């Protein structure tokens, strides 16, 4: 059950590594049924977690992110990538995992900024999971070119 | 505030008994209310005339039954008298 994927396999290794590191990380993904199945995986391998998509109401959104940012032990988030572009606060987060690399770099970097806040204390590292020979490398290249044109025009 | 009574909760309960997974609109609610009111006035009126015809000053269950036999047609009246008799019998037993 849910393992049988290399993305998930390397994620399993790095989640063990960051448990040894002692850093509560993140997830961002596009299609939150994957987030449901990852919820099952993480409840399974015994990781205290919290979930935040668009389906939760606004007071629940702000209160569960407050409950994260006051508690130093709950270990992994679940977020919609695009709906992470709110005015939320994640200073207590310290590491980022993108399970996906979809089109807009400013969404991805915006969620990165939601981690890499003005109140950020330490280096936050970001792991973008990549496959081989498959279409997410194409989307990575296309987004990278669009990022390039964006940054040269408004630098 | 002057509360105005209605048969809303009752027809709602009946609705839940016969069709647990169906709803009811406000217009149809008022229609059902007016319906029950009309039949009430009809049966009670005919029962009153029955009591007056036989020089009686008391409307018992007999007058109501005869009135239902006169107003409702055919099988509707039969089942009505059936349900009525069942109810008045069960009420008579359980004090």
């Amino acid at each position: 059950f849910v393992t049988d994927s290399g993305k998930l396999a390397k994620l399993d290794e790095l989640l063990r590594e960051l448990k040894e590191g002692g850093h509560r990380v993140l997830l961002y993904f596009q299609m939150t049924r994957m987030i449901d199945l990852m919820e099952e995986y993480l409840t399974y391998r015994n990781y205290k977690y919290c979930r935040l998509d668009g389906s939760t109401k606004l007071e629940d959104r702000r209160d569960t992110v407050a409950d994260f940012q006051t508690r130093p032990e709950i270990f992994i988030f679940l977020l919609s990538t695009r709906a992470g572009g709110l005015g939320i606060n994640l200073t207590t987060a310290d590491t980022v995992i993108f399970y996906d690399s979809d089109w807009n770099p400013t969404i991805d970097s915006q969620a990165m900024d939601r981690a890499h806040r003005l109140g950020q204390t330490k280096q936050v590292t970001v792991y973008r999971l990549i496959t081989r020979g498959t279409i997410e490398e194409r989307i990575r290249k296309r987004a990278l070119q669009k990022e390039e044109v964006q940054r040269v025009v408004i630098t | 505030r002057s509360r105005k009574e209605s048969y809303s909760v009752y027809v709602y309960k009946v609705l839940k008994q016969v069709h647990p997974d169906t709803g009811i609109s406000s217009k149809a609610m008022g229609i059902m209310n007016s319906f029950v009111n009309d039949i009430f006035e009809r049966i009670a009126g005919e029962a009153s005339r029955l009591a007056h015809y036989n020089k009686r000053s008391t409307i018992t269950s007999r007058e109501i039954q005869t009135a239902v036999r006169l107003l409702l047609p055919g099988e509707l009246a039969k089942h009505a008298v059936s349900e009525g008799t069942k109810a008045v019998t069960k009420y008579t037993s359980s004090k």
Binding site: - | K27, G30, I31, S34, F35, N37, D38
Partner: protein
């Protein structure tokens, strides 16, 4: 002259709901007349009920009573 307010296609529509395929030309004026008489009687009784209640505003219940006393009970407005 508001009886002409009830237009020809309106009467046509009513006839369609009644299940009529072809309509004569002399139908419309007749319909206006019949409607005029019907409304005359009903509104007369309604205003009578209103004046009996010492009110200057004819309510819906007055219409309901008026229709009920003409043998045309109406559900969905009280009573």
């Amino acid at each position: 002259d508001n009886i002409q307010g009830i237009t020809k296609p309106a009467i046509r529509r009513l006839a369609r709901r009644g299940g009529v395929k072809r309509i004569s030309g002399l139908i419309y004026e007749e319909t206006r007349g019949v409607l005029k008489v019907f409304l005359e009687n009903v509104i007369r009784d309604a205003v009578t009920y209103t004046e009996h209640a010492k009110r200057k505003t004819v309510t819906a219940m007055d219409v309901v009573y008026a229709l009920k006393r003409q043998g045309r009970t109406l559900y969905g407005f009280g009573g």
